[PDB]
CSV table of C-alpha atoms in Angstrom, one decimal:
chain,number,residue,atom,x,y,z
M,11,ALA,CA,0.4,0.1,0.2
M,12,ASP,CA,1.4,3.4,-1.0
M,13,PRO,CA,2.0,5.8,2.3
M,14,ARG,CA,0.9,8.8,0.8
M,15,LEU,CA,-2.3,7.8,0.1
M,16,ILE,CA,-3.1,6.2,3.4
M,17,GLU,CA,-1.8,9.3,4.9
M,18,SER,CA,-4.2,11.2,2.8
M,19,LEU,CA,-7.2,8.8,3.4
M,20,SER,CA,-6.7,8.5,7.0
M,21,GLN,CA,-6.5,12.5,7.3
M,22,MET,CA,-10.3,12.3,5.3
M,23,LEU,CA,-11.6,9.8,7.4
M,24,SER,CA,-10.7,11.7,10.2
M,25,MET,CA,-13.1,14.3,8.7
M,26,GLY,CA,-16.1,12.0,8.8
M,27,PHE,CA,-15.8,10.5,5.5
M,28,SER,CA,-16.1,6.9,4.6
M,29,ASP,CA,-14.5,4.7,2.3
M,30,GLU,CA,-17.4,2.7,1.5
M,31,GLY,CA,-16.9,0.8,-1.7
M,32,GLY,CA,-13.7,2.5,-2.1
M,33,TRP,CA,-15.0,5.8,-3.2
M,34,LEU,CA,-12.8,8.0,-1.7
M,35,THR,CA,-9.8,5.8,-2.6
M,36,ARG,CA,-10.8,6.0,-6.0
M,37,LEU,CA,-11.4,10.0,-5.4
M,38,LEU,CA,-8.2,10.6,-4.0
M,39,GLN,CA,-6.1,8.4,-6.8
M,40,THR,CA,-7.5,10.4,-9.4
M,41,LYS,CA,-6.4,14.0,-7.6
M,42,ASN,CA,-3.0,12.8,-6.7
M,43,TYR,CA,-3.9,12.0,-2.7
M,44,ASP,CA,-4.3,15.8,-3.2
M,45,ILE,CA,-7.2,16.9,-0.5
M,46,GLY,CA,-8.1,20.3,-1.6
M,47,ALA,CA,-8.5,18.6,-4.7
M,48,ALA,CA,-10.6,16.0,-3.4
M,49,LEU,CA,-12.7,18.1,-0.9
M,50,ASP,CA,-13.3,20.5,-4.4
M,51,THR,CA,-14.6,17.9,-6.4
M,52,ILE,CA,-16.8,16.4,-3.3
M,53,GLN,CA,-18.0,20.5,-3.0
M,54,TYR,CA,-19.5,20.1,-6.6
M,55,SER,CA,-21.7,16.9,-6.0
P,29,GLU,CA,-24.9,25.8,23.1
P,30,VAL,CA,-22.6,25.8,19.8
P,31,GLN,CA,-21.3,29.7,18.9
P,32,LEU,CA,-18.9,30.7,16.3
P,33,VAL,CA,-18.6,34.7,16.3
P,34,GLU,CA,-16.4,36.0,12.7
P,35,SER,CA,-14.8,39.2,13.1
P,36,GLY,CA,-12.0,41.1,11.1
P,37,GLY,CA,-13.9,42.0,7.6
P,38,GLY,CA,-14.1,45.0,6.1
P,39,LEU,CA,-13.2,47.1,2.9
P,40,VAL,CA,-9.6,46.2,1.1
P,41,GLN,CA,-7.7,47.5,-2.2
P,42,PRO,CA,-6.5,44.7,-4.4
P,43,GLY,CA,-3.9,43.2,-2.9
P,44,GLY,CA,-4.8,44.2,0.3
P,45,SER,CA,-4.1,41.7,3.3
P,46,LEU,CA,-6.7,41.2,6.0
P,47,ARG,CA,-7.2,38.5,9.0
P,48,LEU,CA,-10.2,37.3,10.6
P,49,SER,CA,-11.0,35.8,13.8
P,50,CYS,CA,-13.7,33.6,15.2
P,51,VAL,CA,-13.9,32.9,18.7
P,52,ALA,CA,-16.1,29.4,19.5
P,53,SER,CA,-17.7,28.2,22.2
P,54,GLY,CA,-19.9,25.0,23.1
P,55,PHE,CA,-17.9,22.1,22.1
P,56,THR,CA,-14.2,20.8,22.1
P,57,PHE,CA,-12.6,23.1,19.9
P,58,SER,CA,-8.8,21.8,20.5
P,59,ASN,CA,-9.5,18.8,18.5
P,60,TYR,CA,-11.8,19.6,15.9
P,61,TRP,CA,-11.6,20.1,12.1
P,62,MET,CA,-12.5,24.1,11.8
P,63,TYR,CA,-13.7,25.3,8.2
P,64,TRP,CA,-14.2,28.5,6.8
P,65,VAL,CA,-16.6,29.1,4.3
P,66,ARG,CA,-17.9,31.9,2.2
P,67,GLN,CA,-20.7,32.6,0.1
P,68,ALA,CA,-20.0,35.4,-3.0
P,69,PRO,CA,-22.2,37.9,-4.5
P,70,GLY,CA,-24.9,35.9,-5.8
P,71,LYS,CA,-23.8,32.7,-5.0
P,72,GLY,CA,-23.7,29.5,-2.6
P,73,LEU,CA,-21.6,29.0,0.3
P,74,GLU,CA,-18.6,27.6,-0.6
P,75,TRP,CA,-15.4,26.1,1.1
P,76,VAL,CA,-12.2,28.1,1.9
P,77,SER,CA,-10.3,26.6,4.1
P,78,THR,CA,-10.0,23.6,6.9
P,79,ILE,CA,-7.9,22.8,9.7
P,80,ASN,CA,-7.4,20.1,12.4
P,81,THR,CA,-7.1,21.7,15.8
P,82,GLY,CA,-5.5,18.6,17.0
P,83,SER,CA,-2.5,17.8,14.9
P,84,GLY,CA,-2.8,21.0,12.7
P,85,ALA,CA,-3.3,19.7,9.2
P,86,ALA,CA,-4.5,22.7,7.0
P,87,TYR,CA,-5.7,22.5,3.1
P,88,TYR,CA,-7.0,25.0,1.0
P,89,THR,CA,-9.3,25.5,-2.0
P,90,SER,CA,-7.1,25.6,-5.2
P,91,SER,CA,-8.3,29.6,-5.6
P,92,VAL,CA,-6.8,30.3,-2.3
P,93,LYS,CA,-3.9,28.2,-2.0
P,94,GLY,CA,-1.0,30.1,-1.5
P,95,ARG,CA,-2.4,33.5,-0.9
P,96,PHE,CA,-5.0,32.5,2.8
P,97,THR,CA,-3.6,31.0,5.9
P,98,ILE,CA,-5.3,29.5,8.7
P,99,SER,CA,-4.2,28.7,12.2
P,100,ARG,CA,-5.8,28.6,15.7
P,101,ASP,CA,-4.9,29.2,19.4
P,102,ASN,CA,-6.2,26.5,21.4
P,103,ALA,CA,-5.9,28.7,24.3
P,104,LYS,CA,-8.2,31.7,23.0
P,105,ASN,CA,-10.7,28.9,21.3
P,106,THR,CA,-9.8,31.2,18.3
P,107,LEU,CA,-9.9,30.8,14.4
P,108,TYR,CA,-7.8,32.5,11.9
P,109,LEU,CA,-7.5,33.2,8.6
P,110,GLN,CA,-4.8,35.4,7.2
P,111,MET,CA,-6.0,36.5,4.1
P,112,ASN,CA,-3.1,37.9,1.6
P,113,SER,CA,-3.4,39.5,-2.0
P,114,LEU,CA,-6.8,39.7,-1.8
P,115,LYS,CA,-8.9,39.8,-5.2
P,116,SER,CA,-12.7,40.8,-6.7
P,117,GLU,CA,-13.5,37.2,-6.5
P,118,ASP,CA,-12.7,37.0,-2.8
P,119,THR,CA,-15.6,39.0,-2.0
P,120,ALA,CA,-17.7,37.5,0.2
P,121,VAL,CA,-18.9,37.0,3.0
P,122,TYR,CA,-16.7,35.1,5.2
P,123,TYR,CA,-17.9,32.1,7.7
P,124,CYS,CA,-16.0,29.8,10.9
P,125,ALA,CA,-18.2,26.1,10.7
P,126,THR,CA,-17.7,22.8,11.9
P,127,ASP,CA,-18.6,21.2,8.2
P,128,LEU,CA,-18.2,21.5,5.0
P,129,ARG,CA,-21.1,23.0,3.8
P,130,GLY,CA,-21.1,25.6,6.5
P,131,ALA,CA,-24.3,24.0,7.8
P,132,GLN,CA,-23.2,24.9,11.6
P,133,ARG,CA,-21.6,28.3,10.8
P,134,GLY,CA,-21.8,31.5,12.7
P,135,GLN,CA,-23.1,35.2,11.8
P,136,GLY,CA,-20.3,35.8,9.6
P,137,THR,CA,-18.2,38.9,8.6
P,138,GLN,CA,-17.9,40.4,5.1
P,139,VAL,CA,-14.9,41.1,2.9
P,140,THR,CA,-15.5,43.7,0.2
P,141,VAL,CA,-12.6,43.9,-2.4
P,142,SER,CA,-12.7,47.3,-4.4
P,143,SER,CA,-9.6,49.7,-5.6
P,144,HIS,CA,-9.7,52.7,-4.0
């Protein structure tokens, strides 16, 4: 497992998000493990 | 129970600097993901920055990264947002919130950027 993904995923898990089905894992992967870029996409639901 | 009081907004020139404060009470502020959100003219609430008051991890939206800086004073129960090189698009009512969408926010402070 990539430690840069584990760190970003754990930071976002503490924010209250889930990883049901791996949606948050896939999001951080498409956003280069950028939490700010991931949070911007989440806002644009 | 939960109370959030913002302050520090005002009218500035393009490129000016401001610092917003937000006094929090009624919950565990010293270990919490605190947010700054803003409502642009005629727009909806959008997140600006977030920080975990326990660890210190800070994250910003793409349009403000490098220009804004979020911080906190756990001993003062205060959340800060240092704003530099302010643009016209930064004009908004700024709230501190306990969530990304700004559901539990304060009354907010006004930041208006106009050339003088």
